[PDB]
Design a protein around this ligand. Structure first.
Ligand SMILES: [Cl-]
Ligand SMILES: [Cl-]
Ligand SMILES: [Cl-]
Ligand SMILES: [Cl-]
Ligand SMILES: [Cl-]
Ligand SMILES: [Cl-]
Ligand SMILES: [Cl-]
Ligand SMILES: [Cl-]
Ligand SMILES: [Cl-]
Ligand SMILES: [Cl-]
Ligand SMILES: [Zn+2]
Ligand SMILES: [Zn+2]
Ligand SMILES: [Zn+2]
Ligand SMILES: [Zn+2]
Ligand SMILES: [Zn+2]
Ligand SMILES: [Zn+2]
Ligand SMILES: [Zn+2]
Ligand SMILES: [Zn+2]
Ligand SMILES: [Zn+2]
Ligand SMILES: [Zn+2]
Ligand SMILES: [Zn+2]
Ligand SMILES: [Zn+2]
Ligand SMILES: [Zn+2]
Ligand SMILES: [Zn+2]
Ligand SMILES: [Zn+2]
Ligand SMILES: [Zn+2]
Lengths: 222, 224, 221, 221
């Protein structure tokens, strides 16, 4: 148990990030991040239909391609560790823009339908032994999770107290479990709030530490 | 699918080449090149203003003359085919000398402002269904923007120049990026250069597809 | 004449490669290589005796076993053709580590002492009607220091090897080939030579020597 | 003519300094500096666009905002005088990172494109009747590589910057000034210029240009 520097909320050009996967990994690696999770979007049916219909980019990984996406991430787990000694964790951002809940899942193994109820999503993810975080809308951007915090008090392993360069006081004031991430899309988003966690350097230990949340701090990388 | 001999980076006296268009086409046709793209320069506004100000030649096609430039090439397409059985593809070299990136567009139809960000230029070229090559500065050459940032631009370009004139650029191959090899022609003697050999049907859409896929692409050194 | 995919520089565990002859053939065959030459090391006497005395593996074919080595390749020509329609060509890497010149010969028929001067080796190989290639050290050297001297000596020079290109051959406009210099499985993916040639050994050698219809091609996973 | 304490090279957070204009004025004013020039960066287009695209801070005044920048300095001239009897002079650091020349102009009135050759920049600034200083990189370069070339070009060269002296200006007997190149609070203590001059802007510029009554002075805590 030393303190690890972590970012659990990062996107690539596979969903709506600006950057190649390899680049993202290199950028976090060379900035000395110890743990990164790639969390590209999967998106509710209705939103995907709407986008197809308007000729917009999907900015999501489709259900058909989800396993290929994970395969891209497993291969990067190897290179991340070898080149940087960094733990890369395959994840996903479950993105329901119809009812407005974004859920970040870390150490995901199967696709989960973003159109499912919050609680059913979280149970499906806990059946995969995934860490489950309530993502906070970034400042640049009424959100269901955040409007119904008490309802979801024992639902999430952690809530985003910080995102990009912003702190959200509601999580701390309630004394809820917390993490802080970049919500990375653009090169300059590597400089953000991050999570510092006291943990053995392995994925089960890390998920356990965030879940306990007693040795978790937030840290502004500048 | 026979393998075709191709040169996607060729300049004429319409921009900063030494020779007239007709003569450039004849020279490549008589040397048995199967596919040539004419990629004369369009340059960022600031570079133009600076040449205009210094009274030095523009060395580029202006935005106002771009359609006239395409019109000359379309007519050259006819002659290239009739006289040599050669496929001439209208193209352009998008030349930002302020920020140091040169992007070759093959099968271009509309002018694109060289001043824009890389990804904006490329998105614009994709809407036109053009093939988008990251040009390498020639060895007679500064730190060049695309080449300093290759991992960032890995999913941006259909191919990178692995070779140019008589030089090879091992960085392209080492990283296993999609590659092309061109003359970057300006002068008679640049006809003898690295070229691209591609397995493809002898039509423009088929050729661009083959280059993008990049699994049946070789490089070939044309010598006297 | 179609364009053939070729690799003229390939090793087995009969010298210092990782893999058996049969397996090297299956690998290249299954990956669509049209022409391969097996070029296991014969070594200068100093190097060989340095290895004997330190109990190191020889990593080479001895003069005594060279005929048995070519006999194995003669037999593999049959299997390579019948199973893959691939042309296997017996060759050798004449390897001098004392004077630092490695010379690949394709379509070899007799042992040539690697300790002999470059010109005598090459004259010997030409008497066998072998194709003679200046090999380039892999990224991880007498010929390359004296290229002008050896301009008319070799039929072709290695412009590419494993994943690396060597600008010096291209710049000088020398005749070129590109090979894997294969020792282990993943080396199968490498720069290769594409050559426009009738698919027979004399034609292939002629086409490399002429070098007017030879390109280089990077085979990727 | 009394001897005036001067600093002709000073930055605020309007470019890449740490501190607001008002605060930079209060600091220098309270420390008895008689003459200060605010010389925030204007930057060559490559550098600026490199910053835009990487999402880095511009650390410069844009051509569009340059007039608003001089307007702020025109207004601060009043406060600097009324509060401290200090002469504030609008200036700029013309900053070319592509060709590596930084040129400080004191008493500037119009934007000059930093991407223009050194002689054209300087001719432009002289048309404005600005004072033109070759800035020296701070300890932590085209002009300094080509000093003979630029002997009659500049009114003065930086012989001192922050806590460092640069023997090359002195040895060649060039005209000299010494400045803080201030970005942060503690840079207020630095080498400064002492100049014998009537306390008005034309007189000060003349005295630096003549350079016969100019010394260098190290302000310490
Ligand atoms: Cl979010
Ligand atoms: Cl988002
Ligand atoms: Cl682990
Ligand atoms: Cl170029
Ligand atoms: Cl050019
Ligand atoms: Cl066509
Ligand atoms: Cl070798
Ligand atoms: Cl070897
Ligand atoms: Cl400076
Ligand atoms: Cl500075
Ligand atoms: Zn997103
Ligand atoms: Zn979101
Ligand atoms: Zn967001
Ligand atoms: Zn997000
Ligand atoms: Zn040109
Ligand atoms: Zn160019
Ligand atoms: Zn060029
Ligand atoms: Zn060019
Ligand atoms: Zn070997
Ligand atoms: Zn060797
Ligand atoms: Zn080797
Ligand atoms: Zn070898
Ligand atoms: Zn500064
Ligand atoms: Zn400076
Ligand atoms: Zn400085
Ligand atoms: Zn400065």
């Amino acid at each position: 148990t030393e303190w690890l520097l972590c970012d659990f909320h990062v996107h690539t050009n596979m969903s709506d990030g600006h950057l190649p996967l390899g680049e993202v990994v290199d950028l976090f690696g060379k900035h000395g991040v110890d743990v990164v999770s790639i969390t590209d979007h999967i998106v509710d049916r209705r939103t995907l239909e709407q986008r197809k219909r308007n000729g917009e980019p999907l900015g999501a990984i489709t259900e058909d391609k989800f396993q290929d996406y994970l395969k891209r991430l497993w291969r990067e787990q190897k290179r991340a560790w070898e080149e940087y000694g960094m733990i890369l964790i395959p994840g996903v951002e479950i993105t329901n823009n119809t009812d407005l809940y974004h859920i970040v899942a870390v150490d995901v193994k199967e696709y989960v339908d973003p159109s499912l109820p919050v609680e059913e999503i979280v149970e499906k993810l806990k059946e995969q032994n995934a860490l489950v975080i309530a993502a906070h809308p970034d400042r640049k951007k009424s959100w269901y999770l955040w409007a119904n915090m008490e309802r979801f008090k024992d639902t999430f392993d952690a809530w985003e107290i910080a995102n990009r360069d912003d702190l959200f006081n509601s999580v701390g004031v309630k004394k809820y479990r917390y993490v802080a991430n970049s919500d990375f899309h653009e090169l300059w988003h590597v400089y953000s709030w991050k999570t510092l966690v006291k943990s053995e350097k392995n994925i089960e230990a890390i998920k356990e530490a965030i879940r306990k949340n007693t040795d978790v701090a937030i840290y502004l990388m500048r």
